Amino acid sequence: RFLKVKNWETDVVLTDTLHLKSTLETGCTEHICMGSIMLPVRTKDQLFPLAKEFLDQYYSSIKRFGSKAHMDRLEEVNKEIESTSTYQLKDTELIYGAKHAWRNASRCVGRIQWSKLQVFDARDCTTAHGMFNYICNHVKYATNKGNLRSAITIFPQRTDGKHDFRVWNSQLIRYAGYKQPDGSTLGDPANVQFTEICIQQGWKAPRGRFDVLPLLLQANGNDPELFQIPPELVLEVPIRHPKFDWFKDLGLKWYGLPAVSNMLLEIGGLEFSACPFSGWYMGTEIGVRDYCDNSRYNILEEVAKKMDLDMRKTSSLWKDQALVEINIAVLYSFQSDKVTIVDHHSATESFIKHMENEYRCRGGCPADWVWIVPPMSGSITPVFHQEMLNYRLTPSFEYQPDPWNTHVW
Amino acid sequence: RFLKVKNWETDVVLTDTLHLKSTLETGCTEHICMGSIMLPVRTKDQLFPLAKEFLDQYYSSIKRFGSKAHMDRLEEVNKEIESTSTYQLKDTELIYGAKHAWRNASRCVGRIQWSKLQVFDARDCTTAHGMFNYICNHVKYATNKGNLRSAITIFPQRTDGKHDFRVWNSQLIRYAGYKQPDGSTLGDPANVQFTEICIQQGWKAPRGRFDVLPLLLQANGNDPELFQIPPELVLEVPIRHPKFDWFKDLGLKWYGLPAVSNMLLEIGGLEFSACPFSGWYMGTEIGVRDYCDNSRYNILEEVAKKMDLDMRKTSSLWKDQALVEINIAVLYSFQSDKVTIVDHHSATESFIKHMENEYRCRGGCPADWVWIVPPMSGSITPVFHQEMLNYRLTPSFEYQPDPWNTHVWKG
Ligand code: HEM
Ligand code: HEM
Ligand SMILES: Cc1cc(N)nc(C[C@H]2CNC[C@H]2NCCNCc2ccc(Cl)cc2)c1
Ligand SMILES: Cc1cc(N)nc(C[C@H]2CNC[C@H]2NCCNCc2ccc(Cl)cc2)c1
Ligand SMILES: C[C@H](O)[C@H](O)[C@H]1CNc2nc(N)[nH]c(=O)c2N1
Ligand SMILES: C[C@H](O)[C@H](O)[C@H]1CNc2nc(N)[nH]c(=O)c2N1
Ligand SMILES: [Zn+2]
């Protein structure tokens, strides 16, 4: 009932009760833990309980739980749902809802920033060009000439499921992937397929190693349209090492804006299938995963050569040595060009502080250890020694099927 | 039911049916995952079914399920239970049992070696001195002058719970930790409390930075007794770096034999409270955890200074740079002194093949991702990208409470 989590490096013990308010399933059972598995229309009967849950916590958050205002709103939404088989959120509810889905994202280490989120209400949007306009404005606002600011743009909610707004890209800004004859892959292997769905739709791929993909926007359920983000709005960073000059010769660069566009935001039962959100990078996401994952730019071997490491034996830890350098470069480059970025040491220390605040202000903090611990130097970061409880709270961000696997053209 | 796990690096998908034989609980529910939580006498009634399940597993393994030998063994065991409230395992069953507890240890990345285990049967042991003799023999055999061999020694099982055999040390070999009045710690902070118990019991502490702790052995539920492991039997490796000549000057060394001695071995319902087992180290256990944990030796700063790294800001990744060098030094040394050791790349790569083979020949391989993934360079090892299922099968190795917290002293 009242679970406890301990930090084994500092012996601090926190008590969690927030989990009791949890409603969604985890995938785990008393017989099997699925903790490491990546991926473990509504009715009026289904919707009202959800809306009620949401409103009560919202009114509770503003110290007006069980007030005429509260009571009144419940009734208004109640009448609206029975009548309209759905409802619309008050601006304040939308903002509160979005901030909280972030607050509840158990896989996000950057949640100490949860309450500082710019919300762009794009619910009056109606077309792909309109979506394009809102997205450019979001990108420009968030980039802020390198001094990044968190934001989310929220398009119209789901209705009959046949009029869904969707951004086909996984992130607003990513590089294209091309499968050459050499069997090899040009650019980012992760995007090969999407890259082709663009071509298949018209895009004139420049076939480069770092080609900024075009946005593929879908509005009201119609077919998706392509748009090239003003190059001037996409801040990029040339990757150079602060000691190895030959580094710049690797020809590496990465974009400054991390911005997830394929998730679904759920607030009080309502579904928002197009809600791109952005913050700023933690160094390892690029240096460790984008650059060194074997299924991504997989650059270790090459960086290894350039360093003249004894790649003969794994026990010389050449892969590890090179990993560190590649990551030192990233932070170095972003910092030099003055684009906001955080290292895994600072981000994890921040998250620990956030957990403590959350435990003593909200009764806990859902967190997914498997995702929170950085992909390098795990145990020298504090989160490694921190026990965490993972459970699902709403409002939330959820994954959803790629549109190209559901679109009735 | 069937469950699938996918490797996001290779797209290889596996199907698990073995989890269907999972009995114990995990700590998780449909509402909460306790996957990162460190730690989430029997009745004839409950014992009967446990022996049966075990015996069925054992006879199936030797291709004699349902045989007369199998049926006689079941009758013999059940008769013994109703008769004495317990039962004794045949040598063969003990060996099979021990090998399987290792095979089922979901937090162990070295399981590819499971079927290769020397089992020493010490169930005829009656005293602390007897325990000491058995342990010295295990240490010498397992050490094998640096060519490490996996081994386990099994002392008498629990009876009424008032006569337990227990090895008070958490590991047969570990360094003493001492709390100074100024608040600093000399030696290994992890063993301060145990080191105090040793001193209280009569140990004469040399008070150094790497003093091998004495063994504190409890036989038949009696008060524990102290014993010093013959020095010539304790293999140690001085740590030095292949290119950094000042590394040897840090004065670091570590023992070669990792041997857990505080866990409980459960086989067919029987409980073996004293069952020390040892293998060989994976580099990071020493280089990352014992050396760099803030609560252990914590040598990152001193090493970073020497390398003259920019320690003014964490974004220089000075901690990460020093960590790599320290781990290179550990591997280099061990390999130079010809003491068995495996690096985390090699070990995780082997575990993945072991895991795949297990899914194919056994229908599964319970594994705890939180523990399998190395404490450094996580994503550049194949296990990071491997989905895993964690569940509990018996036989098994379990945690038990520290003895100094439950023991009834006699005097
Ligand atoms: C301000 C800087 C931020 C930092 C440094 C940060 C950092 C991170 C990191 C390291 C991850 C893991 C990414 C991965 O492994 O794919 C992550 C995941 C995530 N973040 Fe944050 N984050 C930030 C802002 C945001 C914002 C503004 C939101 C949304 C409003 C958010 C929502 C999420 C979600 C839902 C996930 C998990 C998504 C998934 O499962 O793929 N984050 N974040
Ligand atoms: C052959 C060399 C072996 C290697 C390289 C290996 C490696 C490891 C490592 C890296 C861990 C995690 C240690 C930690 O973080 O505390 C571990 C845990 C474990 N290993 Fe192995 N192991 C080996 C042999 C064995 C043997 C022979 C047994 C038993 C017969 C065994 C039983 C276990 C158990 C029970 C755990 C988890 C203990 C706990 O939860 O504290 N291992 N092993
Ligand atoms: C707002 C924000 C801020 C920061 N710093 N980081 C992010 C994360 C985002 C940039 N780096 C990795 C991307 N996430 C990929 C999720 N893959 C899960 C996944 C989902 C589905 C499949 Cl099939 C595979 C994998 C978002
Ligand atoms: C047979 C074998 C072979 C290898 N390679 N490694 C080991 C593991 C052993 C040497 N390095 C760390 C030690 N394990 C301590 C685990 N403590 C967890 C823990 C358990 C309980 C609490 Cl309260 C805290 C922490 C055993
Ligand atoms: C199989 C395993 O769950 C998978 O590789 C996870 C591990 N932890 C992760 N953690 C983060 N932050 N991001 C990821 O993509 C992953 N991948
Ligand atoms: C809180 C968290 O579960 C704890 O720090 C775990 C994480 N993973 C680990 N993994 C291994 N191999 N050994 C450990 O001691 C730990 N500690
Ligand atoms: Zn779980």
Q: Do B3 and A32 meet the contact criterion of CB atoms below 8 Å apart?
A: yes
DSSP element (H, E) containing B281: strand B281-282
Residue A399 token pair = 């994954």
Pocket flag, ligand 1, residue A264 (CB < 6 Å) = no
**CA angle B298–B299–B301, rounded 5-degree value:** 105
Residue A108 annotated as lining a ligand binding site: yes
C-alpha distance from B389 to closest chain A C-alpha (Å)? 6
* φ, ψ (nearest 5 deg) of residue B323: -60, -45
Residue B370 annotated as lining a ligand binding site: yes
* φ, ψ (nearest 5 deg) of residue B196: -65, -40
The Cα–Cα gap between A386 and A371 comes to 13
The Cα–Cα gap between A223 and A32 comes to 42
What lies within 8 Å, CB to CB, of B134 at 6+ separation is B120, B122, B125, B153, B155
What residues does B238 pair with on adjacent strands? Answer: B253
The number of angstroms, rounded, from the C-alpha of A245 to the middle of its chain's C-alpha atoms is 33
* Interface list for B 13-72 with A (CB within 8 A): 19, 22, 25-38
What is the number of the ligand 5 atom nearest to the C-alpha of A36? 3
- Which residues of chain A make contact with B386, given a CB cutoff of 8 A? 36
Pocket flag, ligand 3, residue A374 (CB < 6 Å) = no
Say yes or no for a CB contact (<8 Å) between B29 and A28. yes
Q: Do B142 and B127 meet the contact criterion of CB atoms below 8 Å apart?
A: no
Closest C-alpha to ligand 3, atom 5: A281
Q: How many CB atoms lie within 10 A of CB B317?
A: 29
Say yes or no for a CB contact (<8 Å) between A25 and B30. yes
Breaks in chain B, after residue numbers (C to N greater than 2.5 Å): 40
Q: Do B371 and A373 meet the contact criterion of CB atoms below 8 Å apart?
A: no
The Cα–Cα gap between B55 and B148 comes to 32
Closest CA to B404 of B49, B166, B176, B55: B166
DSSP element (H, E) containing B324: helix B318-336
Q: Which CATH architecture has domain B124-149+164-235+399-403?
A: Alpha-Beta Complex (3.90)
Pocket flag, ligand 5, residue B387 (CB < 6 Å) = yes
Q: Return residues with CB closer than 5 A to ligand 7 (ion).
A: A 28, 33, 35; B 28, 33, 35
Token look-up 């007006």 returns: A64
* φ, ψ (nearest 5 deg) of residue B179: -90, 120
Closest CA to A214 of A297, A122, A132: A132
Say yes or no for a CB contact (<8 Å) between B343 and A315. yes
The region that residue A37 occupies, defined by phi over 0 for left and psi between -120 and 50 for alpha, beta otherwise, is: beta
- Which residues of chain B make contact with A343, given a CB cutoff of 8 A? 314-315, 317
* φ, ψ (nearest 5 deg) of residue B118: -85, 120
Say yes or no for a CB contact (<8 Å) between B33 and A323. no
The Cα–Cα gap between A312 and A51 comes to 61
Q: What is the full DSSP assignment across A206-273?
A: ---SS-BPPEEEE-TTPPPEEE---GGG--EEE---SS-GGGGGG--EEES--EE-S-EEEETTEEES
Residue B270 token pair = 């029987």
A34 to chain B: nearest residue by CA?
Answer: B389
Please name the member of A314, A324, A390 whose beta carbon is closest to the beta carbon of B343.
A314
- Is B16-123+150-160+264-278+348-372 assigned to CATH 3.90.340.10? yes
Cα end-to-end distance, chain B, whole Å = 56
Q: Which fold has domain A236-258+281-346?
A: 3.90.1230
- Which residues of chain B make contact with A321, given a CB cutoff of 8 A? 324, 328
- Exposure of A91 by Cβ count < 10 A (0-12 exposed, 13-18 middle, 19+ buried)? exposed
Residue count (chain B): 411
Q: Do B346 and B335 meet the contact criterion of CB atoms below 8 Å apart?
A: no
Pocket flag, ligand 3, residue A262 (CB < 6 Å) = no
What lies within 8 Å, CB to CB, of B184 at 6+ separation is none
Residue A48 token pair = 């009202």
Residue A171 annotated as lining a ligand binding site: yes
- Which residues of chain B make contact with A377, given a CB cutoff of 8 A? 319-320, 323, 376-377
Sketch the domain layout of chain B as residue ranges.
16-123+150-160+264-278+348-372, 124-149+164-235+399-403, 236-258+281-346
The number of angstroms, rounded, from the C-alpha of A31 to the middle of its chain's C-alpha atoms is 31
Q: Do B11 and B4 meet the contact criterion of CB atoms below 8 Å apart?
A: no
Closest CA to A278 of A194, A366, A174: A174
Amino acid at A44: K
Residue B365 annotated as lining a ligand binding site: no
Token look-up 């040892």 returns: B278
Q: Do A49 and A77 meet the contact criterion of CB atoms below 8 Å apart?
A: no
Cα end-to-end distance, chain A, whole Å = 49
